């Protein structure tokens, strides 16, 4: 709730969140972690949970900074890339799913996280 | 302890046929909690177990299935139950959710405000309610409640497809005579208590396959008394063991057909199909805030 109100006093919410947690600020809590058979494909964003054994799946709206802070999405299409879908996060980054998402991008050809699945 | 591996307990006909006064509910394990599988909200487990029990019921599951989820928000501003519904339902299901307070969710349409402001223009296929009014904690005698139940009863009577189903949260003190009576208009009904929240008088009142006519004449005040008698008589252990194997969690893609029929045309065959979860009757053509 501190960091949520902070990202409303700035023109660059992504940087404001990332600077906050990189400086020791508490990550946003209450991301909606799902229970899943860890038997999925491992892609970044999916219509159903796809965590592998090395990932956790979250409800997409809950790990979207723009959804959580009720601020305008940066997508020119106006449509959130996560809301209504599921987001896979490496299991070693579950301390800050929102920060992981702000910090990383799915590969444009294979849809796995660049650096965390994308073999291209 | 086979029951600990089931998703929860369903009220048996042994208790539905009783005739007793309404008593105070006294659970031996009251308010105990179980830790959750991970950094995982308790409502994840509760909703998953409700879904697991609904997997054993004859739900109609059409294409473009119409699902409305009332009481979906939380004091954390998120909606764990809605995300479970998204994980469970077909990918082409439409989820509309609603709460008095602002939240964000994975529904297709999210409406804020009293459920009475939710205008259901077309009939729906599945209603989930987790609504509960804080004032219900200020307990004289335990009488039937109005609250949001007046709205839900009217919804069942007007805005629910034939063959559609409902799961409506109740508790010892949060309950409605009229809603119990309306369970007699479904092909089958029960109260289902999750193992994840077995230490609470919470149950989900389940109406499976709406027929629009009275199949069972239920005395609703007496039936709540029977529900409390059942809970007072039935050891239930807190458990989430049913969630260890999720390979078959997702709702079966039944492809249930949707037909439009006039009431004069609804005959024995159609009633049989509706009662077996094999048919919905409604338009096949709008949920907004009024
Ligand atoms: C079943 N029960 C009820 N009471 C007494 O009766 C009162 C009201 O009884 P209730 O109908 O609220 O039932 P219960 O206490 O079992 O409900 P619980 O709090 O578990 O709530 C169940 C679900 O309701 C929703 N809910 C409860 N409170 C709120 C709220 N304040 N706001 C939003 N949702 C809420 C939540 O989803 C919650 O999980 C209780 O607050 C308590 O004094 C009991 N007392 C003892 N000693 N042993 C009992 O077994 C017992
Ligand atoms: C137990 S909470 C919901 C928890 C949520 N289902 C979850 O997935 O965590 C009960 C919800 O009922 C909502 N509610 C109570 N009365 C309502 C009403 N009349 N109309 C809409 N929502 C109502 C409350 O605001 C509260 O968020
Ligand atoms: Zn978003
Ligand atoms: Zn790639």
UniProtKB/TrEMBL annotation, chain A:
Zn(2+) 3 binds at residues 107, 110, 118, 120. This is ORF1a. Belongs to the coronaviruses polyprotein 1ab family. The gene is orf1ab. The lineage of its organism: Viruses, Riboviria, Orthornavirae, Pisuviricota, Pisoniviricetes. Residues 1-120 form the ExoN/MTase coactivator domain. Zn(2+) 2 binds at residues 64, 67, 73, 80. It comes from the Viruses. It is found in: Host cytoplasm, Host perinuclear region; Host membrane. Plays a role in the initial induction of autophagosomes from host endoplasmic reticulum. Later, limits the expansion of these phagosomes that are no longer able to deliver viral components to lysosomes. The replicase polyprotein of coronaviruses is a multifunctional protein: it contains the activities necessary for the transcription of negative stranded RNA, leader RNA, subgenomic mRNAs and progeny virion RNA as well as proteinases responsible for the cleavage of the polyprotein into functional products. Disulfide bonds join 107-118.
From TrEMBL, chain B:
It is found in: Host cytoplasm, Host perinuclear region; Host endoplasmic reticulum-Golgi intermediate compartment; Host membrane. Signal peptide: none annotated. S-adenosyl-L-methionine binds at residues 43, 81, 99, 114-115, 132. Coiled coil: none annotated. S-adenosyl-L-homocysteine binds at residues 43, 81, 99, 114-115, 132. Residues 2-290 form the Nidovirus-type SAM-dependent 2'-O-MTase domain. Interacts with nsp8 to form the replication-transcription complex (RTC): nsp12, nsp7, two subunits of nsp8, and up to two subunits of nsp13. Plays a pivotal role in viral transcription by stimulating both nsp14 3'-5' exoribonuclease and nsp16 2'-O-methyltransferase activities. Therefore plays an essential role in viral mRNAs cap methylation. Belongs to the coronaviruses polyprotein 1ab family. This is ORF1ab polyprotein.
């Amino acid at each position: 709730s501190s960091v949520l109100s902070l990202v409303n006093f700035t023109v660059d919410p992504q940087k404001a969140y990332l600077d906050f947690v990189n400086a020791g600020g508490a990550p946003l809590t209450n991301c909606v972690k799902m229970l899943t058979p860890k038997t999925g494909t491992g892609i970044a964003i999916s219509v159903k949970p796809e965590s592998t054994a090395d990932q956790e799946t979250y409800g997409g709206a809950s790990v979207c900074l723009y959804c959580r802070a009720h601020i305008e999405h940066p997508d020119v299409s106006g449509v959130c890339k996560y809301k209504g879908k599921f987001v896979q996060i490496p299991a070693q980054c579950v301390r800050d799913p929102v920060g992981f998402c702000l910090s990383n991008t799915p590969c444009n050809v294979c849809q796995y996280w660049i650096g965390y699945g994308c073999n291209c | 302890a086979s029951a600990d591996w089931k998703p929860g307990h369903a009220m048996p006909s042994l208790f539905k046929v009783q005739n007793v006064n309404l008593e105070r509910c006294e659970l031996a394990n009251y308010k105990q909690s179980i830790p959750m599988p991970r950094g995982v909200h308790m409502n994840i487990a509760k909703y998953m177990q409700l879904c697991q029990y609904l997997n054993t019921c004859t739900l109609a599951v059409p294409a473009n299935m119409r699902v409305i989820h009332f009481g979906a928000g939380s004091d954390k501003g998120i909606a764990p139950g809605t995300s479970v519904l998204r994980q469970w339902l077909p990918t082409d299901a439409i989820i509309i959710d609603n709460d008095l307070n602002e939240f964000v969710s994975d529904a297709d349409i999210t409406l804020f405000g009293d459920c009475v402001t939710v205008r259901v223009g077309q009939q729906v296929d599945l209603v989930i309610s987790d609504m509960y009014d804080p004032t219900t904690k200020n307990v004289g005698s335990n009488e039937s409640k109005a609250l949001f139940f007046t709205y839900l009863c009217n919804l069942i009577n007007n805005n629910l497809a034939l063959g559609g189903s409902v799961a409506i949260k109740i508790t010892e003190h949060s309950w409605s005579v009229e809603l119990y009576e309306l369970m007699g208009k479904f092909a089958w009904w029960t109260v289902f208590c999750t193992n994840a929240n077995a230490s609470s008088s919470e149950g989900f009142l389940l109406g499976i396959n709406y027929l629009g006519t009275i199949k069972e004449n239920i005395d609703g005040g007496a039936m709540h008394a029977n529900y409390i008698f059942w809970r007072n008589s039935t050891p239930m252990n807190l458990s989430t063991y049913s969630l260890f194997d999720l390979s078959k969690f997702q709702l079966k893609l039944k492809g249930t057909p949707v037909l439009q029929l006039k009431e004069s045309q609804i005959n024995e065959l159609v009633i049989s199909l509706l009662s077996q979860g094999k048919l919905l009757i409604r338009d096949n053509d709008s949920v907004s805030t009024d």
